[PDB]
Scaffold this active site. Sequence first.
Site, PDB file in Angstrom:
ATOM      1  N   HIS A   1       0.804  -1.217   0.000  1.00  0.00           N
ATOM      2  CA  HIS A   1       0.000   0.000   0.000  1.00  0.00           C
ATOM      3  C   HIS A   1       0.839   1.270   0.000  1.00  0.00           C
ATOM      4  O   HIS A   1       0.429   2.263  -0.604  1.00  0.00           O
ATOM      5  CB  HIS A   1      -0.949   0.019   1.215  1.00  0.00           C
TER       6      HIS A   1
ATOM      7  N   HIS B   1       5.559   7.006   6.612  1.00  0.00           N
ATOM      8  CA  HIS B   1       5.255   6.605   5.246  1.00  0.00           C
ATOM      9  C   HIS B   1       4.665   7.814   4.536  1.00  0.00           C
ATOM     10  O   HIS B   1       4.436   8.865   5.147  1.00  0.00           O
ATOM     11  CB  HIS B   1       4.257   5.442   5.232  1.00  0.00           C
TER      12      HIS B   1
ATOM     13  N   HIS C   1       1.812   9.141   1.180  1.00  0.00           N
ATOM     14  CA  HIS C   1       0.812   8.935   0.139  1.00  0.00           C
ATOM     15  C   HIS C   1       1.137   9.907  -0.987  1.00  0.00           C
ATOM     16  O   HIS C   1       1.557  11.038  -0.724  1.00  0.00           O
ATOM     17  CB  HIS C   1      -0.609   9.202   0.670  1.00  0.00           C
TER      18      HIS C   1
ATOM     19  N   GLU D   1      -3.678  13.478   1.163  1.00  0.00           N
ATOM     20  CA  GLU D   1      -4.944  13.015   1.722  1.00  0.00           C
ATOM     21  C   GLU D   1      -5.721  14.187   2.314  1.00  0.00           C
ATOM     22  O   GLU D   1      -6.865  14.446   1.928  1.00  0.00           O
ATOM     23  CB  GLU D   1      -4.673  11.911   2.745  1.00  0.00           C
TER      24      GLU D   1
ATOM     25  N   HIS E   1       3.344  11.017   6.650  1.00  0.00           N
ATOM     26  CA  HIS E   1       2.703  10.673   7.920  1.00  0.00           C
ATOM     27  C   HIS E   1       3.747  10.065   8.846  1.00  0.00           C
ATOM     28  O   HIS E   1       4.228   8.950   8.600  1.00  0.00           O
ATOM     29  CB  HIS E   1       1.557   9.685   7.692  1.00  0.00           C
TER      30      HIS E   1
ATOM     31  N   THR F   1      -6.280   6.473   7.890  1.00  0.00           N
ATOM     32  CA  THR F   1      -6.801   6.739   6.550  1.00  0.00           C
ATOM     33  C   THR F   1      -6.813   5.511   5.653  1.00  0.00           C
ATOM     34  O   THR F   1      -7.211   5.621   4.485  1.00  0.00           O
ATOM     35  CB  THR F   1      -6.023   7.856   5.844  1.00  0.00           C
TER      36      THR F   1
HETATM   37  C1  LIG Z   1       0.219 -10.088  15.569  1.00  0.00           C
HETATM   38  C2  LIG Z   1       0.879  -9.596  14.296  1.00  0.00           C
HETATM   39  C3  LIG Z   1      -0.064  -9.851  13.146  1.00  0.00           C
HETATM   40  N1  LIG Z   1       1.497  -8.295  14.358  1.00  0.00           N
HETATM   41  C4  LIG Z   1       2.876  -8.476  13.903  1.00  0.00           C
HETATM   42  C5  LIG Z   1       3.222  -8.020  12.482  1.00  0.00           C
HETATM   43  O1  LIG Z   1       2.212  -8.270  11.568  1.00  0.00           O
HETATM   44  C6  LIG Z   1       3.484  -6.531  12.531  1.00  0.00           C
HETATM   45  O2  LIG Z   1       2.466  -5.876  13.236  1.00  0.00           O
HETATM   46  C7  LIG Z   1       2.293  -4.545  12.838  1.00  0.00           C
HETATM   47  C8  LIG Z   1       1.074  -4.073  12.431  1.00  0.00           C
HETATM   48  C9  LIG Z   1       0.935  -2.751  12.005  1.00  0.00           C
HETATM   49  C10 LIG Z   1       1.988  -1.885  12.073  1.00  0.00           C
HETATM   50  C11 LIG Z   1       1.773  -0.471  11.534  1.00  0.00           C
HETATM   51  O3  LIG Z   1       2.607   0.281  11.247  1.00  0.00           O
HETATM   52  N2  LIG Z   1       0.373  -0.239  11.231  1.00  0.00           N
HETATM   53  C12 LIG Z   1      -0.067   0.981  10.639  1.00  0.00           C
HETATM   54  C13 LIG Z   1      -1.567   1.140  10.676  1.00  0.00           C
HETATM   55  C14 LIG Z   1      -1.785   2.526  10.126  1.00  0.00           C
HETATM   56  C15 LIG Z   1      -1.111   3.553  10.691  1.00  0.00           C
HETATM   57  C16 LIG Z   1      -1.269   4.812  10.210  1.00  0.00           C
HETATM   58  C17 LIG Z   1      -2.115   5.013   9.166  1.00  0.00           C
HETATM   59  S1  LIG Z   1      -2.337   6.719   8.545  1.00  0.00           S
HETATM   60  N3  LIG Z   1      -2.409   6.665   6.866  1.00  0.00           N
HETATM   61  O4  LIG Z   1      -3.584   7.214   9.003  1.00  0.00           O
HETATM   62  O5  LIG Z   1      -1.266   7.440   9.073  1.00  0.00           O
HETATM   63  C18 LIG Z   1      -2.776   3.985   8.593  1.00  0.00           C
HETATM   64  C19 LIG Z   1      -2.613   2.723   9.064  1.00  0.00           C
HETATM   65  C20 LIG Z   1       3.206  -2.354  12.449  1.00  0.00           C
HETATM   66  C21 LIG Z   1       3.362  -3.667  12.858  1.00  0.00           C
HETATM   67 ZN   LIG Z   2      -0.825   7.565   6.019  1.00  0.00          ZN
END
Ligand SMILES: CC(C)NC[C@@H](O)COc1ccc(C(=O)NCCc2ccc(S(N)(=O)=O)cc2)cc1
Ligand SMILES: [Zn+2]
Length: 257
Positions: A61, A91, A93, A103, A116, A195
């Site tokens: 993404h 990251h 967009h 955005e 972001h 987002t």
């Molecule tokens: C249990 C497991 C599945 N977790 C381990 C592995 O999959 C990693 O886990 C993660 C999961 C998510 C993140 C992470 O960075 N998530 C971001 C979610 C996220 C953050 C910010 C935005 S925005 N565009 O509004 O700023 C959108 C989505 C980092 C590590």
């Molecule tokens: Zn973002």
Amino acid sequence: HWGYGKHNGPEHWHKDFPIAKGERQSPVDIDTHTAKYDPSLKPLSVSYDQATSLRILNNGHAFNVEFDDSQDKAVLKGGPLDGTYRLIQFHFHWGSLDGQGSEHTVDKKKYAAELHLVHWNTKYGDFGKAVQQPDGLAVLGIFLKVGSAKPGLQKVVDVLDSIKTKGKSADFTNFDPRGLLPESLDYWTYPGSLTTPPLLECVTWIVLKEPISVSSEQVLKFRKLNFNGEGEPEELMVDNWRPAQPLKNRQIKASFK
Ligand SMILES: CC(C)NC[C@@H](O)COc1ccc(C(=O)NCCc2ccc(S(N)(=O)=O)cc2)cc1
Ligand SMILES: [Zn+2]
Ligand SMILES: CC(C)NC[C@@H](O)COc1ccc(C(=O)NCCc2ccc(S(N)(=O)=O)cc2)cc1
């Protein structure tokens, strides 16, 4: 699954993520004449001198630069925030054309891209707990316009060839995110959401008034990334932005007159 194409894009997300039509969704248009100066807002405290970057990942993404958030190293405090928020990742967009990609919008104006810097509230212990809280995250949003190059961005640009496709990662240590900040920390703030799916309503948004400028060549290299994995049909990673959502019962506040 969800994405940014005609058959899985933002207008479809509500079918799997009904919160897409919720009461505090992001991004929004920032109407500068309607935002209210709040003299009780404090200056932002951006403390990035001890930042420990680890890795850069193409997740299908966008690309994320990830940080060590297991101690207070790079933190955001002050402004509208109570407590300490640790930097987990940043990251962007971006668009297929210089006149789109951000955005958030400002008086309906779209920028070429939006950075972001994602932070989470340490009182919730880990990032997964924080996303389940109305004050769990603080995202610092910074607009990008095309003009002169941003020197502090070039190390990011030069590694993108190594993470062209979904699932690729590369070491990315010793990167200083202070090189991505504009001069001024004047900001707008409002309560919002992630987002992208799962669109959780957990974010205090802090959007800087002053854009940074990046060169044509820098943004062109963003547009060479792929949404797809290696060996899958090539689809350029461009236009990975959600459009502005209804403001509903919210007020955007300004830190500046
Ligand atoms: C249990 C497991 C599945 N977790 C381990 C592995 O999959 C990693 O886990 C993660 C999961 C998510 C993140 C992470 O960075 N998530 C971001 C979610 C996220 C953050 C910010 C935005 S925005 N565009 O509004 O700023 C959108 C989505 C980092 C590590
Ligand atoms: Zn973002
Ligand atoms: C490894 C250290 C140094 N940093 C990484 C750390 O900040 C990531 O922390 C996490 C990330 C995820 C979880 C977790 O509980 N995952 C299962 C539930 C879960 C799934 C997906 C998300 S998303 N797509 O919004 O980001 C969030 C939570 C728990 C802790």
